């Protein structure tokens, strides 16, 4: 991959692997989410990061995902090449937004797009804090100055408020535990695992007859390596919509909430 | 990737991704196992095996199934490094075929790991393993070297050693392991790599933090269904050596058995 001519965004091509596809022989949404993560890490490394600054490392601060929103029009087939362009933009003292565009390497048509909201947090106390002006100036130079939104729409699904699922849930997957493959290089559960856990409560009948078009996932609390999670889903609707909730198997503490939108094959 | 000059083996280069590495920022053994699988699929596709079945095998409802996997790693590739893998097949008479791999450093050319696997023929409906017929053997002998080519040539080595059954009580255990949709392949079967991850779940974190996995030999006895639950058992048999057993959470039916060998960091 490489930064674009203006150095304000990054592009990378990926060939879809055998183990990355589903029953329809096309890449899963979790594989897509992993590819978004990979191009985001490479963009950060290319502009002198390792996504902490010296001021963030000095104050023990980190970037944490608050929301992820993915919309897929066409999933790449096994063996196809997909090009992803990614970039960041400041949103004032709230935090930063990171967006992506997925394109067909042969046709150049847009086959998917994503947006995510990130907030600053103290690594040790887990206390969120607004972005200080001194931290902002350090990365503003790597972002475009004019707004550049993967989801410009006058009123888009990426910024909709998500409500809390009411018991009893219509569908459920109980006793989900992460394994070592679910952890990152810092022994924390990978943000993609939550996507897989959310989708575990969707009935296989929906999975066999429908394709996932949209998914918006709010991140509320981290799941520890030794925690157990319950995945809950309720239908809220040619198109199927679901409301999701991830919570701790025991006390029922909320870790995630989201919505998915599926269309008929 | 591409077939070598003689068309008797295949090579492919992989860049190590951010989500593919462990706590010491070097690729996991499951990532290595996935890369072995990917280069094996590409080798099969390049010599005329469509979405590793032949026209005669398709006609008779026959498939290739792994019986044993043996991986030895000297140096795990770091995040961002390129690793080149060369793979090939060889017939072993009526028993079945063997598939071997050599892992090399793209910069130095030194061997950083090597693997071998034994495959047998099985009816995909009855699960009855059969010997390699004759009309089938001749159909693929032309894609394998005629003189022996072994990733593990040593006379009386670890790849061919007999594995015993773990005796209760196990010293360590991880119970209630269930596969999720990401653990399944394009045919809704549990991926052979998931078993490696499940075996390693019962290894104490103390071993994982102080040691590196050098060797792993895994026998495949029975498939784990999408709705099955597995228990992972381990006992120290000693460098550190362990004896492993995967079995069904309920009745205690054997699905896998193996051994690992770990070196101090
Ligand atoms: C271009 C970009 C500048 C902003 C920070 N960054 C990130 O990737 C990031 C995503 S969420 C918070 N930090 C590194 C590189
Ligand atoms: C070169 C090779 C030769 C025949 C078998 N094969 C495999 O991929 C295979 C079978 S069992 C493990 N590997 C297809 C192509």
UniProtKB/Swiss-Prot annotation, chain B:
Coiled coil: none annotated. One of its GO terms (molecular function) is fatty acyl-[ACP] hydrolase activity. It catalyses: (9Z)-octadecenoyl-[ACP] + H2O = (9Z)-octadecenoate + holo-[ACP] + H(+). The keyword Secreted does not apply. The active site is at residues 187, 189, 224. Its main location: plastid. The keyword Lipid biosynthesis applies. Its EC number is 3.1.2.14. GO terms for biological process: fatty acid biosynthetic process. Keywords: Chloroplast, Fatty acid biosynthesis, Fatty acid metabolism, Hydrolase, Lipid biosynthesis, Lipid metabolism, Plastid, Transit peptide. It is found in: Plastid, Chloroplast. GO terms for cellular component: chloroplast. Belongs to the acyl-ACP thioesterase family. Plays an essential role in chain termination during de novo fatty acid synthesis. Possesses high thioesterase activity for oleoyl-ACP versus other acyl-ACPs. Substrate preference is 18:1 > 18:0 > 16:1. This is Oleoyl-acyl carrier protein thioesterase 1, chloroplastic. The lineage of its organism: Eukaryota, Viridiplantae, Streptophyta, Embryophyta, Tracheophyta. The chain holds residues 75 to 359 of 362 of the full protein.
